[PDB]
Design a protein around this ligand. Structure first.
Ligand SMILES: *[C@@H]1O[C@H](CO)[C@@H](O[C@@H]2O[C@H](CO)[C@@H](O)[C@H](O)[C@H]2NC(C)=O)[C@H](O)[C@H]1NC(C)=O
Ligand SMILES: *[C@@H]1O[C@H](CO)[C@@H](O[C@@H]2O[C@H](CO)[C@@H](O)[C@H](O)[C@H]2NC(C)=O)[C@H](O)[C@H]1NC(C)=O
Lengths: 49, 35, 35
């Protein structure tokens, strides 16, 4: 659901698309995640290991 | 590279104000090429 | 619907920067059949 569950009613949203809405609040645009989905997936998977 | 991409057309807003011009630009060559 | 709105013109920029060239375009298209 993302962040909504902390404001009001909880709205569903696909997780590979929540992230492109979390880059956008940093300063890098959202056209970087899709182009690097597999590498960021492996970096996230290896980091938690 | 992106997955989940969906085919669609996009309505270009830079076109119709000059497509309306292109509507009358091509009209302006109907009389130009008439004689 | 909105209250307090006032009447004024808005200098929309795309037409006159085109019309700076459409004026000589309109002059050239119509005067081609003049002579
Ligand atoms: C999205 O549209 C493009 C172009 O309209 C499609 O690309 C071609 O589509 C035809 C029809 O299926 C195929 O025969 C070609 O092989 C496609 N070109 C290539 C380079 O693969 C594309 O398949 C469409 N994608 C979806 C998901 O509908
Ligand atoms: C802004 O201009 C419009 C039209 O140029 C005005 O609308 C007119 O208002 C009078 C007021 O009685 C009516 O009699 C006309 O029938 C209206 N014409 C149209 C086309 O709607 C409007 O009043 C103006 N607004 C202000 C704040 O002066």
């Amino acid at each position: 659901s993302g962040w909504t569950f902390g404001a009001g009613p909880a709205l569903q949203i696909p997780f590979p698309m929540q992230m492109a809405y979390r880059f956008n609040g940093i300063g890098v645009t959202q056209n970087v995640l899709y182009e690097n989905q597999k590498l960021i997936a492996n970096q996230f998977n290896s980091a938690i290991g | 590279v992106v997955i989940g991409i969906v085919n669609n057309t996009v309505y270009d807003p830079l076109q119709p104000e000059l497509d309306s011009f292109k509507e009358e630009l091509d009209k302006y060559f109907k009389n130009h090429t008439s004689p």
